[PDB]
Design a protein around this nucleic acid. Structure first.
Ligand SMILES: [Mg+2]
Ligand SMILES: [Mg+2]
Ligand SMILES: [Mg+2]
Ligand SMILES: [Mg+2]
Length: 234
RNA sequence: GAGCCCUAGCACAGGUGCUGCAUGGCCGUCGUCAGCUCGUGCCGUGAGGUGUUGGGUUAAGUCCCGCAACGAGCGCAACCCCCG
């Protein structure tokens, strides 16, 4: 189910904060706003999903990023709802590019997995039960979706690339294909497979980002429900 | 002419004689001041920068939140002694 499902509540977004490189994917300045030509949305979807498919059934790992305010959660849903890695709270200087080092944080996160369930089940110089169980605190918060990922992904999926630029940069540096949902905010030129959409409305992120995860599990057989995601959707 | 010890020579001893501006070691000092760095990534043609900066907080670069950085090292703290 696609087509008018998109016009559902998810077409055009921002106005007069545009990138004129995005002028190709626009329908009009109707009532002050940029409303985004959907025929070409759909157009780009086929090519993009086509890439996802092939990538997925060839057994690839996509890396999902959405640190954005109201995308935050509907990421770690569909990301985990497909066993793919995700970056949720904040992108870090050189997850990809400084990958080896940023990994020793995960290498050392699960050292503390294995100190919870431990012979030190309740022991070690008692003020070290915040000193270390608050190290695992931060480690937890950030590397929760990143922890799976043990070689660079074969792709990345991004919700707002002008928001998420520090990532996309690393991607392109590393020849890693950039998949993203992008609106009039953004610079198409450096998004390899674009979902000309709406970086913002939670429904729009949902419709799109879930289907893409359908396609992913569905390209290893075993489709499920209407997705464990409708947040407080409101 | 084994050792030892004497006098005559010999190779050497000795020197608190100079150079702390040839030096080691040890000390003083800014100063127990909250600092000085490195590894990798990143930015810059480059010297270099980021990190360490910022907002809150500490006796402290002490910790917190934030952030193209993420972590480490010598410091600080703690591990030692005395007094309750
Ligand atoms: Mg001297
Ligand atoms: Mg000297
Ligand atoms: Mg003198
Ligand atoms: Mg002198």
């Amino acid at each position: 189910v696609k087509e008018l499902l998109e016009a559902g509540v998810h077409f055009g977004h921002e106005r007069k904060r545009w990138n004129p490189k995005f002028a190709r994917y626009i329908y009009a300045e109707r009532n002050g706003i940029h409303i985004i030509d959907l025929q070409k949305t759909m157009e780009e979807l086929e090519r993009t999903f086509r890439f996802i498919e092939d990538l997925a059934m060839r057994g690839g790992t996509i890396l999902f990023v959405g640190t954005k305010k109201q995308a935050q959660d509907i990421v770690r849903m569909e990301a985990e709802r497909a066993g793919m890695p995700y970056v949720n709270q904040r992108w870090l200087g050189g997850m990809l590019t400084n990958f080896k080092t940023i990994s020793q944080r995960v290498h050392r996160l699960e050292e503390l997995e294995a100190l919870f369930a431990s012979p030190e089940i309740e022991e070690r110089p008692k003020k070290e039960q915040v000193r270390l169980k608050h190290e695992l605190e931060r480690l937890q918060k950030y590397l929760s979706g990143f922890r799976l990922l043990k070689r660079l992904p074969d792709a990345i999926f991004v919700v707002d690339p002008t928001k998420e630029a520090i990532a996309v940069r690393e991607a392109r540096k590393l020849f890693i294909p950039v998949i993203a949902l992008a609106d009039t905010d953004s610079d198409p030129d450096l998004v390899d497979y674009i979902i000309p959409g709406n970086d913002d409305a939670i429904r729009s992120i949902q419709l799109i980002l879930s289907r893409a995860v359908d396609l992913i599990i569905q390209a290893r057989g075993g489709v499920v429900e209407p997705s464990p995601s409708y947040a407080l959707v409101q």
